[PDB]
């Protein structure tokens, strides 16, 4: 799988298309009743992936509903993250006793649309990241993906907004050239609903098959 290359009580599942036959669980069906086909397909497929991952940890097939801000609602004692983009649906789930939080993101490995890099990056990131990343890789898109995994790991623990300017992310590249590590440093107050405050979040990135994947797994 693609997500295994960005991961270190934890399970995952991913699909690259929307298989025929899959349906939402009855409890999930109202959430996409008036949604277009592209949205229903990604919603149904990513939650099938979530249930495949949850099954590996011994959780019965459960619906994945949404919270007030759209965040996924996991079964008791579980945490996880979902992502879907063109050609990718992915889920990573963990047991809360050992895994405090998970955040993952996937995006096509393409240059960012005009003007978006400046809206999602800090000046030091634009200056330093091209020097730590392999030539010709879309480091701007990889930066955006790391910001998204950071927010997805952050929000279940804080229930607070995190802006793109509120996290400074530094990168390293493995010897292979297409995978590496990152560290996201939270610049604002990192107080959480329970447990110690969030300061630095360590994650991994990977470019493979036209996709960028990022994941953060915070140990309990
Ligand atoms: O594709 P993306 O990377 O945008 O991820 C979207 C998913 O992130 C998850 N998500 C949305 N808001 C979130 C938040 N505030 N915190 C964490 N995860 C969130 C959802 O599960 C969403 O997918 P769904 O709408 O099918 O549930
Ligand atoms: C480092 C801080 N990152 C963020 N706040 N990211 C987002 O809000 N992404 C996002 C966005 C952004 C691009 C505005 C739109 C819809 C859904 C999402 C989810 C991933 C929550
Ligand atoms: Mg998506
Ligand atoms: Mg995303
Ligand atoms: Mg492509």
UniProtKB/Swiss-Prot annotation:
GO terms for cellular component: enterobactin synthetase complex; plasma membrane
* Coiled-coil annotated residue ranges, if any: none
Q: Which reaction does it catalyse?
A: apo-[ACP] + CoA = holo-[ACP] + adenosine 3',5'-bisphosphate + H(+)
- Pfam families noted in UniProt: 4PPT_N, ACPS
Q: Summarize the activity regulation.
A: Inhibited by the amidino-urea compound 1-[(2,6-diethylphenyl)-3-N-ethylcarbamimodoyl]urea (compound 8918). It acts by binding to the phosphopantetheine pocket in the active site. Inhibition by compound 8918 kills M.tuberculosis.
GO molecular-function terms, A-Z:
holo-[acyl-carrier-protein] synthase activity; magnesium ion binding
Instruction: Report the protein name in the record.
Output: 4'-phosphopantetheinyl transferase PptT
Organism annotation = Mycobacterium tuberculosis (strain ATCC 25618 / H37Rv)
Taxonomy, top ranks, is: Bacteria, Bacillati, Actinomycetota, Actinomycetes, Mycobacteriales
């Amino acid at each position: 799988t693609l997500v295994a290359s960005v991961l270190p009580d934890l399970a995952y599942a991913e699909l690259y298309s929307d298989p025929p036959g899959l349906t939402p669980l009855p409890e999930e069906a109202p959430l996409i009743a008036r949604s277009v086909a592209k949205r229903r397909n990604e919603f149904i497929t990513v939650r099938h992936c979530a249930r495949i991952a949850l099954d590996q940890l011994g959780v019965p097939p459960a619906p994945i509903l949404k919270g007030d801000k759209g965040e996924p609602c996991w079964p008791d004692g579980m945490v996880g993250s979902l992502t879907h983009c063109a050609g990718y649906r992915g889920a990573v789930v963990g047991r809360r006793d050992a895994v405090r939080s998970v955040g993952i993101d996937a995006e096509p490995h393409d240059v960012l649309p005009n003007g978006v890099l400046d809206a999602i990056s800090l000046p030091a990131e634009r200056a330093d990241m091209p020097r730590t990343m392999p030539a010709a890789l879309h480091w701007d898109r990889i930066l955006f993906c790391a910001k998204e995994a950071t927010y997805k790991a952050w929000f279940p623990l804080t229930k607070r907004w995190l802006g793109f300017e509120d996290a400074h992310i530094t990168f390293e590249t493995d010897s292979t050239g297409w995978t590496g590590r990152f560290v996201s440093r939270i610049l604002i107050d990192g107080s959480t609903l329970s447990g110690p405050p969030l300061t630095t979040l360590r994650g991994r990135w990977s470019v493979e098959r036209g996709l960028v994947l990022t994941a953060i797994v915070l140990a309990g």
